[model samples]
Target: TAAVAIRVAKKKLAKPPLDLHYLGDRVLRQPAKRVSRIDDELRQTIRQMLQTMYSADGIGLAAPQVGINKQLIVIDLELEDEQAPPLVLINPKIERTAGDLEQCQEGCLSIPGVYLDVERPEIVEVSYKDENGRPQRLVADGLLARCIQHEMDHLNGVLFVDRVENRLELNEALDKKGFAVQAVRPVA
Candidate 1:
């Protein structure tokens, strides 16, 4: 995946616009501000974010990850399938949720090499804006739902590491990667 990501980065961007901010970074914890205006410039920024996300082999990315504290997110489920379309969400919000909790192993680009089981809602009705700033709604389940929620958390300064079921193991794994275990903010 890393090799593919690097190659895709080389193909798409002259220089990667998105840089991964680690768990302890102050910027990651800051509440992102909503965009007041939407235009081609914003779309262009979203495109850059997408390229950076693909380069990092991530399925989703938030604008804050690139040092822009704007309520923008880009997601592409087809990391292995380049033909699939990508989704861009501006000021996304979870409108409603249904179904029981689902457990899945989640990881983040910021906290590289740390994977832990996290429980989240299985189905969610998300209200968001597309690249054109038109409002849109999506009812997502499975991986799509998980990915959407995960990226949405970023806008609120939350990371998947916070929801890990096992903290001791999560700490050890993050420590092994030279990442601070204390950086995690626990969520109920």
Candidate 2:
């Protein structure tokens, strides 16, 4: 298991044969896909993954960063308590989602400091695997729900910027820092 590095690209892993850092500029990306299996390997990975997420104080992490581009994500919405039960989503499919339908604040370890207001479902239900490979469903609301949706989007190479409210701040920062503003929209 490796720590989630948003934009910090690295080598690919051995197991599962995953792509290395395929996260894109927007939240809609390539082959947003994954395979879910009921096995012990999933449990071990979940444990180590939670450990890393807690250390960084992040609510969600996707499989892409660790070289798994599958529709896998793990989250522990609890801001406090490292021992809290972790939520693992394998081949997670969004059954349904609802929201204001407006762009909201979102960030990714893939593209750090590029906070953007991306539209997201206010509420969502996702079916995925638990730590023990048991099937489970989660209904998320508010920030937690939004964050989960965000990570799931990464499975296909989507970034929050695509759904973000306005790219002005992101553009200005990119221009000043020379981060490249080629594909982004004009910011006021």
Candidate 3:
């Protein structure tokens, strides 16, 4: 299996190649399709997604957020480390989740300036395909785990705002950011 070795500088681009679909956009609500092929085109999408993420100062991004309905995600927590390679997960699936549900503040690039608390498992085991089309599995905890789970939700047309339990806070946060509260479809 070949290593996923695409690299890009973690700096905001003057003009990002992709445009992020914001909250309430129909694109964000549509479930993404699975990627059937991992070719140079997919790799190019990954590169552009990384550039868009960095440009928006985001640690993670999903294809749906960029109006591409595909099960693809890119993440990088270590923005300061020039040598750190960003994570690219193709058709990522959570195999298992462990530990008690932990509440953490979460934000999205699509819903900027609105952060809310959401509970999720502290650890997760994920199976995914690498950029080179090789199968890969990862056990992640802390921020990484949360980030992956958050991005994975996008693949199913779910947003972090939808998981927020406190309606008052959720409404307040969305109101503050000028986002429509009606757009949230809460998970039961």
Candidate 4:
């Protein structure tokens, strides 16, 4: 069953076939395109992405992270809770943001083993299409809000490292993690 398959994929911690494009890779810096048509093909891609995310134990993943240029993202915050469902955002757009900036520890699958403090808005109102190609809107907060912004940044060729306030510390952290700090394009 499809549901059973999805559930199995979610628990996989073994690395899957999907190649996760890493920091400093030219492919990671490329912007993604808006999805024009949503169909079974798109759904298949989402399933693969979900599997990859699960395999990597990632909460969120964007198409660009997998060397795809489509504006698509999959997220599952339920790694700590099986009852929670995953989400897919196709051609997502952040319509509005509210609340104060908050600093939180954020990590990316593309930047493996590197975690740093990044400040982002607390709440966001987003517009996107679901896996069924149906339009949807959401006012998300907490981890969901941060995850949406983080993945959306990937669609725009931005990494969480770009928003780190402490460059030297961030550099040392990434260096210790074996990732080149030069890959970060700091938001100016």
Best by lDDT: 3
lDDT of 1 by residue, 101-171 (tens): 99998888777788889899999999988877689999999998999999889999998888887868887
Could you give candidate 3's per-residue lDDT for residues 36-150 as a string of tens digits?
Answer: 9998788888989999999999999999999898999999996467668888899988999999999999999999999899999999999999888889999999999999999
TM-score of 2: 0.72
- Better by TM-score, candidate 3 or 2: 3
TM-scores, one per candidate: 0.89, 0.72, 0.94, 0.91
Per-residue C-alpha lDDT of model 4 across residues 63-178, encoded as one tens digit per residue: 99998889999988954777576888999999999999999999999998888999999999999998777899999999999999999999999999999989787978889878
Clash counts per candidate, in order, are 0, 18, 0, 0
lDDT of 3: 0.92
Score residue 48 of candidate 4 by CA lDDT: 83
- Evaluate all candidate structures by whole-model CA lDDT and list the values in order: 0.82, 0.61, 0.92, 0.87
Question: Which wins on TM-score, candidate 1 or candidate 2?
Answer: 1
Preferred candidate (TM-score higher): 1 or 4? 4
**Candidate 4 segments exceeding 4 Å error:** 1-8, 13-15, 79-81
lDDT (Cα, tens digit) per residue for candidate 2, span 60-121: 77866655545678776765673466567887788998766645667665565556566666
lDDT value for candidate 2? Answer: 0.61
The parts of candidate 3 lying over 4 Å away from their true place are 1-5, 79-81
* Candidate 2 regions with alpha-carbon error over 4 angstroms: 1-29, 80-82, 176-178, 183-188
lDDT of candidate 4?
0.87
